Each structure stands twice: as structure tokens, then as C-alpha cells.
């Protein structure tokens, strides 16, 4: 219990900023998010 409380915690604001940063930077290469052409579709 004590060591779990001992860990340092970042404020939810920077976690949100990092979660947004990772999502927007990788948005263009997600075939599910951005509908991909039938020329690429391998099925």
C-alpha cells in the first residue's frame, strides 16, 4: 500500500495533452479512422 502511494503522479492535464498528441500525430496512418482506398485493401 505505502509504495503504491509513494509513486509520483502527473496532473491529468499533461496526460491529456500527451494522449491528444499521440492521437493526432498517428491519425493519418490509421486505416480504420481515415477510410483507406480499395487499391490498398488486401482482402
Partner 1 sequence: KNQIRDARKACADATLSQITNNIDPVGRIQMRTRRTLRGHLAKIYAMHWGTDSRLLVSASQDGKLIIWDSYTTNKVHAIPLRSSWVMTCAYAPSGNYVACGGLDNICSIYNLKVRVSRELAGHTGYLSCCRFLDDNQIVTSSGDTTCALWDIETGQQTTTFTGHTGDVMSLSLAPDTRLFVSGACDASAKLWDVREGMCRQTFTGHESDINAICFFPNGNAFATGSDDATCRLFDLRADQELMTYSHDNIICGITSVSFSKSGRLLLAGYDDFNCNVWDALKADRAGVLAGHDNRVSCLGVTDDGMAVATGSWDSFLKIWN
Tell me the CB-side half-sphere exposure of residue 4, using CA atoms within 13 A: 1
Number of residues that this document lists for the chain: 43
Q: How far apart are CA 34 and CA 37, in angstroms?
A: 10
Does 43 sit near partner 1 (CB under 8 A)? yes
CB-nearer residue toward partner 1: 5 or 39: 5
CB-nearer residue toward partner 1: 39 or 42: 42
Does 1 sit near partner 1 (CB under 8 A)? yes
- Which DSSP category does 27 fall into? G
Binding site for partner 1 (CB under 8 A): 1-5, 7, 9-13, 15-16, 18-20, 22-23, 26-27, 29-33, 36, 41-43
Amino acid at each position: 500500500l505505502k509504495m503504491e502511494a509513494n509513486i509520483d503522479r502527473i496532473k491529468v492535464s499533461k496526460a491529456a495533452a500527451d494522449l491528444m498528441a499521440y492521437c493526432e500525430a498517428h491519425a493519418k496512418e490509421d486505416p480504420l479512422l481515415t477510410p483507406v482506398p480499395a487499391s490498398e485493401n488486401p482482402f
